[PDB]
Amino acid sequence: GSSGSSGTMLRVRSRDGLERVSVDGPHITVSQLKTLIQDQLQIPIHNQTLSTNRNLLLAKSPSDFLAFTDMADPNLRISSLNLAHGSMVYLAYEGERTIRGSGPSSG
């Protein structure tokens, strides 16, 4: 809950269902993106598979996912596809997610 600063939200599509993740902007790179979804969806970047095509939901094998190499570069910026607060995306990961956890403490 912050006032003034406007957060960015994107609509990701997975095999489990359409999900959403919070981002900052284009200034962020795939590395930061995956990380976000990695800290949100609790999915590993080594598994996370970004793709601006619904055909990603088709890929069942690993090689198939290798077909989508648009957002593989961690140095690549989302600006490459121009994702705005509303744009759509498709996520794809192997296996399952992980376990979340966080403990905010003021030291």
Tab-separated table of C-alpha atoms in Angstrom:
chain	number	residue	atom	x	y	z
A	1	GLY	CA	0.000	0.000	0.000
A	2	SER	CA	1.918	2.972	-1.347
A	3	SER	CA	0.673	6.394	-2.379
A	4	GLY	CA	2.057	8.281	-5.354
A	5	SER	CA	4.173	5.586	-6.963
A	6	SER	CA	2.249	3.554	-9.510
A	7	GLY	CA	2.977	-0.155	-9.711
A	8	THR	CA	2.914	-2.216	-12.884
A	9	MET	CA	0.897	-5.383	-13.358
A	10	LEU	CA	0.973	-7.891	-16.192
A	11	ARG	CA	-1.302	-10.772	-17.113
A	12	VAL	CA	0.567	-14.038	-17.524
A	13	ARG	CA	-1.019	-17.182	-18.913
A	14	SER	CA	-0.050	-20.615	-17.647
A	15	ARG	CA	-1.277	-24.163	-18.130
A	16	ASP	CA	-2.690	-24.085	-14.620
A	17	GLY	CA	-4.500	-20.853	-15.394
A	18	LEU	CA	-4.098	-17.165	-16.144
A	19	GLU	CA	-1.933	-15.507	-13.519
A	20	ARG	CA	-0.683	-11.997	-12.856
A	21	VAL	CA	2.628	-10.612	-11.654
A	22	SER	CA	3.748	-7.206	-10.439
A	23	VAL	CA	6.635	-5.486	-12.178
A	24	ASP	CA	8.301	-2.087	-12.230
A	25	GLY	CA	8.547	-1.252	-15.913
A	26	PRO	CA	10.604	-1.722	-19.086
A	27	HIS	CA	13.706	-0.575	-17.246
A	28	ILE	CA	13.611	-4.096	-15.860
A	29	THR	CA	15.108	-7.034	-17.718
A	30	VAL	CA	13.957	-10.613	-18.165
A	31	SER	CA	16.333	-11.395	-15.324
A	32	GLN	CA	14.327	-9.122	-13.058
A	33	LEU	CA	11.089	-10.419	-14.525
A	34	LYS	CA	11.655	-14.127	-14.013
A	35	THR	CA	12.895	-13.202	-10.559
A	36	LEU	CA	9.600	-11.466	-9.880
A	37	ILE	CA	7.617	-14.479	-11.026
A	38	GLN	CA	10.196	-16.552	-9.190
A	39	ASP	CA	9.468	-14.713	-5.962
A	40	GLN	CA	5.762	-14.622	-6.723
A	41	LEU	CA	4.959	-17.796	-8.622
A	42	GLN	CA	7.790	-19.366	-6.659
A	43	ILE	CA	9.018	-20.752	-9.959
A	44	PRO	CA	12.701	-21.241	-10.804
A	45	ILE	CA	14.233	-19.119	-13.538
A	46	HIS	CA	15.926	-22.252	-14.823
A	47	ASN	CA	12.393	-23.466	-15.432
A	48	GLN	CA	10.495	-20.259	-16.094
A	49	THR	CA	9.725	-19.885	-19.781
A	50	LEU	CA	8.549	-16.512	-21.031
A	51	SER	CA	6.889	-16.292	-24.426
A	52	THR	CA	4.655	-13.798	-26.189
A	53	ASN	CA	2.842	-16.656	-27.883
A	54	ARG	CA	0.057	-18.904	-26.653
A	55	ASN	CA	1.838	-21.675	-28.518
A	56	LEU	CA	3.907	-21.930	-25.360
A	57	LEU	CA	0.958	-23.625	-23.698
A	58	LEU	CA	1.381	-26.223	-26.419
A	59	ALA	CA	5.005	-27.058	-25.716
A	60	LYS	CA	4.971	-30.156	-23.543
A	61	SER	CA	8.612	-31.122	-23.914
A	62	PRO	CA	11.789	-29.190	-23.086
A	63	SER	CA	12.987	-28.889	-26.664
A	64	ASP	CA	9.596	-27.462	-27.555
A	65	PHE	CA	10.128	-24.655	-25.072
A	66	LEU	CA	13.526	-24.115	-26.650
A	67	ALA	CA	11.506	-22.996	-29.649
A	68	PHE	CA	10.632	-19.815	-27.795
A	69	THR	CA	13.782	-17.745	-27.438
A	70	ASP	CA	12.372	-14.235	-27.327
A	71	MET	CA	12.607	-13.689	-23.589
A	72	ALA	CA	15.448	-16.036	-22.726
A	73	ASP	CA	18.136	-13.384	-22.464
A	74	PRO	CA	18.314	-12.144	-18.865
A	75	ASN	CA	19.831	-8.929	-20.165
A	76	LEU	CA	16.891	-8.493	-22.509
A	77	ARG	CA	14.328	-5.860	-21.602
A	78	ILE	CA	10.575	-6.333	-21.714
A	79	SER	CA	10.587	-3.189	-23.821
A	80	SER	CA	11.597	-5.563	-26.591
A	81	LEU	CA	7.986	-6.688	-26.724
A	82	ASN	CA	6.618	-3.520	-25.169
A	83	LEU	CA	4.666	-4.859	-22.214
A	84	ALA	CA	2.375	-2.317	-20.599
A	85	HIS	CA	0.004	-2.515	-17.655
A	86	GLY	CA	-2.431	-4.839	-19.384
A	87	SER	CA	-0.346	-6.659	-21.966
A	88	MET	CA	-0.572	-10.436	-22.012
A	89	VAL	CA	2.097	-13.092	-21.623
A	90	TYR	CA	2.439	-16.849	-21.316
A	91	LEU	CA	4.451	-18.600	-18.631
A	92	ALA	CA	5.826	-22.120	-18.834
A	93	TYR	CA	7.772	-24.065	-16.235
A	94	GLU	CA	8.893	-27.649	-15.763
A	95	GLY	CA	7.938	-29.818	-12.811
A	96	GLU	CA	6.373	-27.684	-10.105
A	97	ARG	CA	6.933	-24.549	-8.059
A	98	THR	CA	8.728	-24.152	-4.749
A	99	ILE	CA	7.948	-23.127	-1.191
A	100	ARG	CA	7.469	-19.484	-0.278
A	101	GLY	CA	8.712	-17.723	2.832
A	102	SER	CA	9.420	-14.248	4.156
A	103	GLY	CA	9.982	-12.626	7.529
A	104	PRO	CA	10.182	-8.823	7.660
A	105	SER	CA	12.119	-7.628	10.684
A	106	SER	CA	13.395	-4.177	11.573
A	107	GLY	CA	16.938	-4.314	12.899
